[PDB]
Target: CmnG
Amino acid sequence: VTADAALEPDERAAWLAYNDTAEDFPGPHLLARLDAVAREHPDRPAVHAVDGVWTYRELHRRADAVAAFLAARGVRPGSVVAIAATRALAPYAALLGVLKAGCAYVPVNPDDPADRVAFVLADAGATPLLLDTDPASLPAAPAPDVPHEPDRVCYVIYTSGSTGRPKGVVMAERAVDNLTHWVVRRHDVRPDDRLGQTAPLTFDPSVQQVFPAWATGACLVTVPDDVQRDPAAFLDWLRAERVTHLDLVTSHWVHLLNAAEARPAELPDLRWIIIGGETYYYHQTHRWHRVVSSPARLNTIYGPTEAAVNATEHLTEPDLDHGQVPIGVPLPNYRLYALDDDGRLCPPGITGEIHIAGAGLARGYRSAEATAKAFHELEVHSGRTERLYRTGDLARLVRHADRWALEFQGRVDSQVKISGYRVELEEVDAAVKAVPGVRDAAVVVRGAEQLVCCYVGDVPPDRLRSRLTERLPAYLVPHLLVPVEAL
Ligand SMILES: Nc1ncnc2c1ncn2[C@@H]1O[C@H](COP(=O)(O)O)[C@@H](O)[C@H]1O
Ligand SMILES: [Mg+2]
Model:
C-alpha cells in the first residue's frame, strides 16, 4: 500500500535518515521580525538600489504609505497587488507595503510584453494601482491596523510553465518564514552584512536575499542591470560594494568563473554564494577557488518555485576536482522522495522523479487545474501521508562523504534553460513565425548562454528583433537572428 513497500530495511532506513529534517525556529512570525528590526535599528541601511539608500525607518515609512494608499482604494487584506520589478528603491516600498496591508505581491517586469502582463494581472487577481503611480511618492501615513492571520499569502510568482500556460505559484507565510530562518542561520547573516540581489524581483532567488536582509538589520543591495551583463564589471562591483552574500544562477556563475580566470579576483568581504539552477562539476568549482581569493563558500541549492525557492543544499568542497556536485540534503522541514513511474520509492542509487513535501510547499497555483495536476497525497512510509509537489525533475539518492545526498539527473520533459532562464524552444518558434514576413524559423540552443534563430523571411534582423521584443520577454529574444535562404 505504502510507497516504500517493496524496499528492504536498509533501503528504507536510508530514506528515513535522509528526510530526518524537522527543526523548530523561534521568534515571532516573519513580518513581526521585520517590524522589530525597524524598531530596534531605524538608522541602519535597509536597501541600496540604483537611486539611493533607505534607512529601515524610511523603508518602513514609505511602505506604510503604500499600505494606507491600498486601504484607501478598497484593497482589503487577502488581495493580490502587482509591483513593478525594477532595480530602483520604489519596488521595495511597494512589496513591503503590500505585505503590511495584509496582501500578497505579484512582481511584474514593466518591460515585459503588454499581453503577458495582462494575463498575469488577470490570473493573479491583482490590481495594477502600484504599476500606474510611483509607490515611493505616495502621501505619508501610519500603517493601517491589520489583524494578524496565520499563513497569509505573501507572493504570487509566475514561472514559464508551458507555452500559453503561465503558472502563478501562490506562496504563503509559513513557507517564506521557514526559508528566511534557514538563510539567516545557515549563512550566518548579521546586521553588518550586505546581501546582493542578482535576480530581479520577478524570480524567486530575490526572496532569499530580501527577507533575510530585512529580518536581521542587514542591507539589501540590488545588483544593477549594467553590471550583470559584464562579468568582469560584476566581479569588481562585488568588491566595491563589500557584498557578503550573493545569489547566482549556475550559468551566470560560469560567466563569472571565466572572468575570474581572465583576471583573478580578490573578494575579501564575500562569505556565501548561494548558487544553483543547473548541474555543475567539481572541476569547475575547483577552478573557481584557484582564481577567486575569498572566504566565500559555494552553497549549491536545488528547488522549484513551488517549494519556496530552495529544497536541498550542498556545501561545495573546494578540494574536490572531478565529478558532479550533488544537490545535497533537504532544507529544514523539507522532505524529498524519488518515485518511479508507478509511485514507489526508489532504492538508493536508482533514478526517480523528485516529489517534495514539507514546510516550503506553495499553497498551489492560482489555477485549479494546474494545482490538481502537480499537488497530490501519498503514503510514502507506513503511517506517514504526505502532501507532495510533483517536480518533473529526476534524481537518485547517493552516498557522498558519509551521508546520503540527492544527485540531479535531468527532467522528464524537454524544458531547458538559456542564460539560466527556463525556455520552451517551441514558444520562441511560434513567436518568430508569427511575425508577418517570416515564412519559417528554427531556434537552436548554442551553448547554455546563446539562443540562435535561423529564419526564412523578407524582414531584416534588426526589424525582426524590434517585433520580437513587443511579443517575447527580453531574455527569450534570440541572441542571434540569422536570415537564411532555406533551413
Ligand atoms: N542545482 C540544480 N541542479 C540542476 N538543476 C536544477 C538545480 N536547481 C534548479 N534546477 C532545475 O531548475 C528548475 C527550476 O528551479 P529554479 O531555477 O531554482 O527556479 C528545477 O525544477 C530543476 O529542473
Ligand atoms: Mg529554486
Summary: The CA atoms of residues 415 and 449 lie 15 Å apart. Residues 276-279, 300, 302-305, 327, 391, 393, 408, 411 surround adenosine monophosphate (ligand 1) (CB under 6 Å).
